[PDB]
Design a protein around this ligand. Structure first.
Ligand SMILES: [Cl-]
Ligand code: NA
Ligand code: NA
Length: 314
DNA sequence: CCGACAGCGCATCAGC
DNA sequence: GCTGATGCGC
DNA sequence: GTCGG
């Protein structure tokens, strides 16, 4: 219906984020692109789109130019600009943000090949990002996600049967494909080397292949199913305290729209929902001590809601 | 008119 | 050497 | 860039 418009807005969004370094303009374009994508009519004018929440004067004007000419002069110029397009492209490498991309392009390093012959200028993360550039941009079919879950749940329980691990994100919502694997981890001995032992076992059975970052609570790395040959995949593992675990599962399961609606409804019922804890608000707005949570349902019961299945959380 | 627009873990830099 | 800021991803 | 106090 409006794919030409949403691609335009998405392309504008990236350039604001990657080149202009205007993160708020980036989100504004994405928000507009998103609301337009859910609009069930073929937009005929900018004024029509202006009615939608997140679409203001400037975007309405851009849509008018797009509907009348089939293009955007501003975009056409940006696409042909060597500096801007190179900066924009380099940010696709995990570990290279707008700042690093700008530095590289300043030094004549503009392509994937330029990065390869300039390894000395790349940090550890960026080298991993360069190494698996293609693989990281691939989606992960649910069948592989299931096999990945099998390995993670098996090895985690092997380290200690008292661990609790949940694969969250879109996979838990029942998506047929995922961008990465997000694992939440907890243990009864952890409340408000547990993570290391789990990471160590997973790289012992050669599931985890690389490490982007690793601390006491958060691991970010690369993994691969055993074998053609499966592409390397992004995997994160978070160690969360037991009393904050199910607030974490709720949050990291999503979706974003669902979390917003649930947080808003929580306010009207007199509660505030964090990624960590759920707390009651006093008459003056003073938040009290965190409420005891032992499951996802408890959060819904606190704010008088029927437990929503992850499958229905859009 | 003009401030909010999420916030945090980890890696690594800038200053001392 | 340490502390705080910055970049990055999410 | 858009919304809203
Ligand atoms: Cl809190
Ligand atoms: Na609007
Ligand atoms: Na990047």
């Amino acid at each position: 219906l409006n794919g030409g418009i949403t691609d335009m807005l998405t392309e504008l969004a990236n350039f604001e984020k990657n080149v202009s370094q205007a993160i708020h303009k980036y989100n504004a374009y994405r928000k507009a692109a998103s609301v337009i994508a859910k609009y069930p009519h073929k937009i005929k004018s900018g004024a029509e789109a202006k009615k939608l929440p997140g679409v203001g004067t400037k975007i309405a004007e851009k849509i008018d130019e797009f509907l009348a000419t089939g293009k955007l002069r501003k975009l056409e110029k940006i696409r042909q600009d060597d500096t801007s397009s190179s900066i924009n492209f380099l940010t696709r490498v995990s570990g290279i943000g707008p700042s690093a991309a700008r530095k590289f392009v300043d030094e004549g390093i503009k392509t994937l090949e330029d990065l390869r012959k300039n390894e000395d200028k790349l940090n550890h993360h960026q080298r991993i990002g360069l190494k698996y550039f293609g693989d990281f941009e691939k989606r992960i079919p649910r069948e592989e996600m299931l096999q990945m879950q099998d390995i993670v749940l098996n090895e985690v329980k092997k380290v200690d049967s008292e661990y609790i691990a949940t694969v969250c994100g879109s996979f838990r919502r029942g998506a047929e494909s995922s961008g990465d694997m997000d694992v939440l981890l907890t243990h009864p001995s952890f409340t408000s080397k547990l993570l290391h032992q789990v990471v160590e076992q997973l790289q012992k059975v050669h599931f985890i292949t690389d490490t982007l970052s690793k601390g006491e609570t958060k691991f970010m790395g690369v993994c691969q199913l055993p074998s053609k040959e499966y592409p390397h995949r992004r995997i994160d593992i978070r160690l969360i305290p037991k009393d904050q675990y199910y607030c974490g599962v709720l949050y990291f399961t999503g979706s974003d729209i669902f979390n917003k609606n649930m947080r808003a409804h929580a306010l009207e019922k007199g509660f505030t929902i964090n990624k960590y804890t759920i707390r009651p608000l006093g008459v003056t707005g003073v938040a009290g001590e965190p409420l005891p949570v032992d499951s996802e349902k408890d959060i819904f019961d606190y704010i008088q809601w029927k437990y929503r299945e992850p499958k229905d959380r859009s």
